Design an enzyme around this catalytic site. Structure first.
Site, PDB file in Angstrom:
ATOM      1  N   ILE A  16      54.786 -46.100  -9.346  1.00  0.00           N
ATOM      2  CA  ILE A  16      53.636 -45.604  -8.578  1.00  0.00           C
ATOM      3  C   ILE A  16      53.945 -44.177  -8.104  1.00  0.00           C
ATOM      4  CG2 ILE A  16      52.380 -45.921  -6.365  1.00  0.00           C
ATOM      5  CD1 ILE A  16      52.900 -49.071  -6.784  1.00  0.00           C
ATOM      6  N   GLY A  17      55.119 -43.997  -7.512  1.00  0.00           N
ATOM      7  CA  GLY A  17      55.585 -42.719  -6.994  1.00  0.00           C
ATOM      8  C   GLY A  17      57.075 -42.729  -6.739  1.00  0.00           C
ATOM      9  N   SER A  18      57.661 -41.542  -6.552  1.00  0.00           N
ATOM     10  CA  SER A  18      59.090 -41.414  -6.294  1.00  0.00           C
ATOM     11  C   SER A  18      59.352 -40.300  -5.301  1.00  0.00           C
ATOM     12  CB  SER A  18      59.862 -41.183  -7.592  1.00  0.00           C
ATOM     13  N   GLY A  19      59.917 -40.666  -4.153  1.00  0.00           N
ATOM     14  CA  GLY A  19      60.284 -39.727  -3.097  1.00  0.00           C
ATOM     15  C   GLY A  19      61.588 -39.023  -3.419  1.00  0.00           C
ATOM     16  N   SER A  21      65.067 -40.073  -2.099  1.00  0.00           N
ATOM     17  CA  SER A  21      66.036 -41.159  -2.245  1.00  0.00           C
ATOM     18  C   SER A  21      65.406 -42.429  -2.844  1.00  0.00           C
ATOM     19  CB  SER A  21      66.631 -41.480  -0.874  1.00  0.00           C
ATOM     20  OG  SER A  21      67.548 -42.562  -0.896  1.00  0.00           O
ATOM     21  N   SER A  22      64.097 -42.641  -2.594  1.00  0.00           N
ATOM     22  CA  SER A  22      63.383 -43.838  -3.010  1.00  0.00           C
ATOM     23  C   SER A  22      62.411 -43.677  -4.192  1.00  0.00           C
ATOM     24  CB  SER A  22      62.653 -44.447  -1.820  1.00  0.00           C
ATOM     25  OG  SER A  22      61.684 -43.558  -1.296  1.00  0.00           O
ATOM     26  N   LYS A  23      61.995 -44.836  -4.736  1.00  0.00           N
ATOM     27  CA  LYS A  23      61.058 -45.022  -5.837  1.00  0.00           C
ATOM     28  C   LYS A  23      60.176 -46.242  -5.505  1.00  0.00           C
ATOM     29  N   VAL A  24      58.872 -46.181  -5.833  1.00  0.00           N
ATOM     30  CA  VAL A  24      57.945 -47.305  -5.661  1.00  0.00           C
ATOM     31  C   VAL A  24      57.394 -47.684  -7.035  1.00  0.00           C
ATOM     32  CG1 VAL A  24      56.015 -45.909  -4.736  1.00  0.00           C
ATOM     33  CG2 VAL A  24      55.982 -48.406  -4.459  1.00  0.00           C
ATOM     34  N   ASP A 132      52.768 -37.499  12.095  1.00  0.00           N
ATOM     35  CA  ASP A 132      52.624 -36.837  10.804  1.00  0.00           C
ATOM     36  C   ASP A 132      51.499 -37.432   9.976  1.00  0.00           C
ATOM     37  OD1 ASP A 132      53.483 -34.719   9.164  1.00  0.00           O
ATOM     38  OD2 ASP A 132      54.639 -36.082   7.900  1.00  0.00           O
TER      39      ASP A 132
HETATM   40  C1  LIG Z   1      48.381 -41.356  -7.815  1.00  0.00           C
HETATM   41  N1  LIG Z   1      48.696 -42.586  -7.072  1.00  0.00           N
HETATM   42  C2  LIG Z   1      50.106 -42.703  -6.665  1.00  0.00           C
HETATM   43  C3  LIG Z   1      47.917 -43.716  -7.226  1.00  0.00           C
HETATM   44  O1  LIG Z   1      46.878 -43.677  -7.864  1.00  0.00           O
HETATM   45  C4  LIG Z   1      48.389 -44.961  -6.590  1.00  0.00           C
HETATM   46  C5  LIG Z   1      48.653 -44.956  -5.228  1.00  0.00           C
HETATM   47  C6  LIG Z   1      49.061 -46.111  -4.587  1.00  0.00           C
HETATM   48  C7  LIG Z   1      49.210 -47.294  -5.314  1.00  0.00           C
HETATM   49  N2  LIG Z   1      49.576 -48.527  -4.775  1.00  0.00           N
HETATM   50  C8  LIG Z   1      50.521 -48.803  -3.792  1.00  0.00           C
HETATM   51  C9  LIG Z   1      51.298 -47.738  -3.301  1.00  0.00           C
HETATM   52  C10 LIG Z   1      52.214 -48.079  -2.316  1.00  0.00           C
HETATM   53  C11 LIG Z   1      52.339 -49.412  -1.863  1.00  0.00           C
HETATM   54  C12 LIG Z   1      51.521 -50.382  -2.423  1.00  0.00           C
HETATM   55  N3  LIG Z   1      50.626 -50.108  -3.366  1.00  0.00           N
HETATM   56  C13 LIG Z   1      53.343 -49.447  -0.855  1.00  0.00           C
HETATM   57  C14 LIG Z   1      53.816 -48.177  -0.692  1.00  0.00           C
HETATM   58  C15 LIG Z   1      54.821 -47.775   0.239  1.00  0.00           C
HETATM   59  C16 LIG Z   1      55.883 -46.900   0.187  1.00  0.00           C
HETATM   60  N4  LIG Z   1      56.538 -46.937   1.429  1.00  0.00           N
HETATM   61  C17 LIG Z   1      55.856 -47.814   2.155  1.00  0.00           C
HETATM   62  O2  LIG Z   1      54.801 -48.354   1.477  1.00  0.00           O
HETATM   63  N5  LIG Z   1      53.129 -47.302  -1.594  1.00  0.00           N
HETATM   64  C18 LIG Z   1      53.328 -45.904  -1.723  1.00  0.00           C
HETATM   65  O3  LIG Z   1      54.151 -45.280  -1.111  1.00  0.00           O
HETATM   66  O4  LIG Z   1      52.485 -45.324  -2.616  1.00  0.00           O
HETATM   67  C19 LIG Z   1      52.480 -43.862  -2.693  1.00  0.00           C
HETATM   68  C20 LIG Z   1      53.853 -43.442  -3.166  1.00  0.00           C
HETATM   69  C21 LIG Z   1      51.412 -43.463  -3.683  1.00  0.00           C
HETATM   70  C22 LIG Z   1      52.184 -43.319  -1.315  1.00  0.00           C
HETATM   71  C23 LIG Z   1      48.948 -47.252  -6.683  1.00  0.00           C
HETATM   72 CL1  LIG Z   1      49.131 -48.675  -7.628  1.00  0.00          CL
HETATM   73  C24 LIG Z   1      48.542 -46.114  -7.335  1.00  0.00           C
END
Ligand SMILES: CN(C)C(=O)c1ccc(Nc2cc3c(cn2)cc(-c2cnco2)n3C(=O)OC(C)(C)C)c(Cl)c1
Length: 253
Positions: A16-19, A21-24, A132
Site C-alpha cells: 500500500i505504502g512504505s515510510g 523504517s516501515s512498510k504497509v 500534525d
Molecule cells: C495511493 N494509496 C496509498 C491508496 O490508494 C491506498 C491508501 C490506503 C489503503 N488502505 C489502507 C491503508 C492503511 C491501513 C489500512 N488500509 C492502515 C494503515 C496504517 C499505517 N499506520 C497505521 O495505519 N494504512 C496506511 O498507512 O496507508 C497509507 C500508507 C496509504 C497512509 C489502500 Cl488499500 C490504498
C-alpha cells in the site's frame, strides 16, 4: 510472498505504502479475508523511537473500544527485530481521494467531517493532541472516515499548520485549525494558504492577522460559519471539538 503474525499465515497482495523504517501491505488470511499489515524494521531503532512506537500501539489498542472512527487493530507481533500490525483494510486515504475527486458531494463532506470530529474528539478525551493532522491520516473504510495515526508514531506539507505552532518558535485547539483546513480544502478545493508558493512567506501569512483569509459565499451558510470559527488565529477565540459537535452544520441536514 507470505508472513506470519501470532501463528496465523498472511499472503501479500501488494504494498500500500512504505515510510522510512516501515512498510504497509494489502494481505489475505487463510479464510481469504483482506487486512493491512504494517511491518516495522527495528534493527536501527533507538530507545526514544522504540518507546514512541510502543506508545502509539498502546493507544491504538485502548482506543479500539472507544470509537469505530479509529482504524481496527486485530493483532500484532512485537520482537526486538520487528513489529507486525494486523489492521483492517481501507479503500483509500482521504488525501489521495481528494486529489482524484475534483467536485465533492455536500452530503459526503458533512459525513466525513462528522467522522473526523468523532476520531479527533476520542484522542482528546485521552489527552492526545495529534498536532500534525492531515488528509493522509484519515482512511475511507466502507464510506466511513477513520483516523490512521495519533502523531506519536510520527517524527520517527505546512498548509495545515496552526499559527500558535509557528509563533511559539499547542492544545486540542491546534487540531481544530488543521481540521478546519481539511474542511476548507473540501469546500473551496484549496487550503487557506495554498496560493503562497514561497514556504517562508506562507508561514508569515499563517501568523499575520492583517492577512485576512477569504471565505467566498457558498449555499451552506452553516459550513462557512464552521470554517470561520475553526480558522480563528487566537486559540482562545477558536471553536472547540465538543462545540463543533453541536454546531448546526454537524447536527442538521
Ligand atoms: C495511493 N494509496 C496509498 C491508496 O490508494 C491506498 C491508501 C490506503 C489503503 N488502505 C489502507 C491503508 C492503511 C491501513 C489500512 N488500509 C492502515 C494503515 C496504517 C499505517 N499506520 C497505521 O495505519 N494504512 C496506511 O498507512 O496507508 C497509507 C500508507 C496509504 C497512509 C489502500 Cl488499500 C490504498
Amino acid at each position: 510472498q507470505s508472513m506470519s503474525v501470532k501463528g496465523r499465515i498472511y499472503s501479500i497482495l501488494k504494498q500500500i505504502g512504505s515510510g522510512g523504517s516501515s512498510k504497509v501491505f494489502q494481505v489475505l488470511n487463510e479464510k481469504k479475508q483482506i487486512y493491512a499489515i504494517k511491518y516495522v524494521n527495528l534493527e536501527e531503532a533507538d530507545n526514544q523511537t522504540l518507546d514512541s512506537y510502543r506508545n502509539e500501539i498502546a493507544y491504538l489498542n485502548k482506543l479500539q473500544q472507544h470509537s469505530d472512527k479509529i482504524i481496527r487493530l486485530y493483532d500484532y507481533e512485537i520482537t526486538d527485530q520487528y513489529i507486525y500490525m494486523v489492521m483492517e483494510c481501507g479503500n483509500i486515504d482521504l488525501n489521495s481521494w481528494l486529489k482524484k475527486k475534483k467536485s465533492i458531494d455536500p452530503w459526503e463532506r458533512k459525513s466525513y467531517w462528522k467522522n473526523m470530529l468523532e476520531a479527533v474528539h476520542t484522542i482528546h478525551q485521552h489527552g492526545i493532541v495529534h498536532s500534525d493532522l492531515k488528509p493522509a491520516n484519515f482512511l475511507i473504510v466502507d464510506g466511513m472516515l477513520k483516523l490512521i495515526d495519533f502523531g506519536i508514531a510520527n517524527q520517527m506539507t505546512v498548509n495545515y499548520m496552526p499559527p500558535e505552532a509557528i509563533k511559539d518558535m499547542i492544545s486540542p485547539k491546534s487540531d481544530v485549525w488543521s481540521l478546519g483546513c481539511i474542511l476548507y480544502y473540501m469546500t473551496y478545493g484549496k487550503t487557506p494558504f495554498q496560493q503562497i508558493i514561497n514556504q517562508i512567506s506562507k508561514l508569515h501569512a499563517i501568523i499575520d492577522p492583517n492577512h485576512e483569509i477569504e471565505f467566498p459565499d457558498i449555499p451552506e451558510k452553516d459550513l462557512q460559519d464552521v470554517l470561520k470559527c475553526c480558522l480563528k488565529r487566537d486559540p482562545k477565540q477558536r471553536i472547540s471539538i465538543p462545540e463543533l459537535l453541536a454546531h448546526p452544520y454537524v447536527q442538521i441536514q
